[PDB]
């Protein structure tokens, strides 16, 4: 366990499958310049649903479908109903947006239900097969997606869509404008710090902070999940593992919840931006 603890210390806090362009690819450098090179795993995990739904798209019908196709139309009907009846901005491809981002955050949090330690104790054969083992002993084994940079990209993508609408409703002038109920102060220096600076930071940071919060929503929740898995790793045999199961159940219950509220608030921002002023 103790050496296993050291391996765990090395392994999970890795960055993008320990990848860094113009440098090495398994133990390149702690916190040096690098790029994201694990998101592709989740991208393909999404292409999985892409094909799974191309199945139903080509095997589309009006009658009774097979069980899996019936469940797919369950989910499609459900999500379309939710997005439309909640609210719609411009009826331009918003619903496909919402449904795909739903299922993506769903899956991207989902895979974590697998063991952290089965991945290395299996892929050790492949690591010894190609590209060394000692940097793999440091950190080179794949980890279920846990980088926040995917969250940052998604959040900024949403923010870009928000900006695109805000210019398409052209409310940017009023969007910079804000409601300030703080006009006066009884003394000179406090009024000096009041007039320009107080309201300027007010109109600046408000909408800026939100997407940051959303990205860290995703990251912190999924991160908390992986860390619980990590603590489960100890007690190799004296435990009966009978108490990790209930937390795992609860975590599963959560997964859907954060994913859903995430795409909710996505819709909420799209709605408010698609509204006047």
């Amino acid at each position: 366990k103790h050496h296993l603890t050291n391996m765990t210390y090395g392994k999970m806090p890795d960055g993008t499958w320990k990848l860094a362009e113009t440098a090495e690819e398994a133990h390149s450098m702690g916190f040096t310049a690098i790029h994201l090179d694990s998101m592709g795993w989740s991208i393909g995990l999404g292409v999985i649903f892409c094909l799974l739904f191309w199945i139903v798209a080509r095997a589309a019908n009006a009658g009774v479908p097979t069980k899996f196709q019936s469940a797919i139309e369950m989910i499609i009907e459900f999500v379309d109903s939710s997005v439309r009846d909640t609210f719609h901005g411009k009826s331009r491809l918003i619903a496909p947006l919402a449904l795909t981002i739903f299922v993506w955050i769903f899956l991207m949090n989902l895979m974590d239900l697998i063991p952290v330690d089965w991945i290395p104790q299996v892929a050790a054969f492949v690591g010894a097969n190609v590209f060394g083992m000692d940097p793999h002993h440091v950190y080179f084994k794949i980890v279920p997606s846990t980088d926040p940079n995917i969250t940052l990209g998604m959040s900024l993508s949403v923010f870009v869509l928000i900006l695109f609408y805000s210019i398409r409703e052209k409310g940017v002038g009023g969007f910079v404008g804000e409601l300030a109920l703080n006009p006066f102060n009884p003394s000179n220096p406090v009024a000096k710090a009041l007039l320009i600076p107080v309201n300027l930071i007010l109109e600046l940071v408000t909408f800026l902070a939100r997407p940051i919060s959303l990205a860290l929503r995703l990251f912190g929740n999924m991160y908390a999940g992986e860390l619980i898995f990590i603590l489960i790793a100890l007690l190799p045999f004296w435990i009966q593992w009978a108490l990790s199961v209930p937390w795992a159940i609860f975590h599963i219950l959560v997964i859907t919840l954060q994913a859903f509220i995430f795409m909710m608030l996505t819709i909420v921002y799209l709605s408010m931006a698609s509204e006047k002023h």
Binding site: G63, K67, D117, W118, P236, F237, W241, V245
Partner: protein, 51 residues
């Protein structure tokens, strides 16, 4: 040691899928069958009304 931990995980997943089968399948299955049956009923109503 390592085998012991991995086997503990496997037994855990056994208990999971035991409860996953018992608790997760029925509601989804029932909803699927119910909608399939009710859609069939709507179509039969259409045919009957046509005749």
């Amino acid at each position: 040691n390592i085998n012991l931990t991995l086997i503990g995980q496997a037994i855990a997943f056994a208990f999971f899928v035991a409860f996953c089968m018992k608790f997760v399948w029925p509601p989804l299955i029932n909803a699927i069958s119910e909608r399939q049956r009710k859609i069939a009923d709507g179509l039969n109503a259409a045919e009957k009304a046509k005749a």
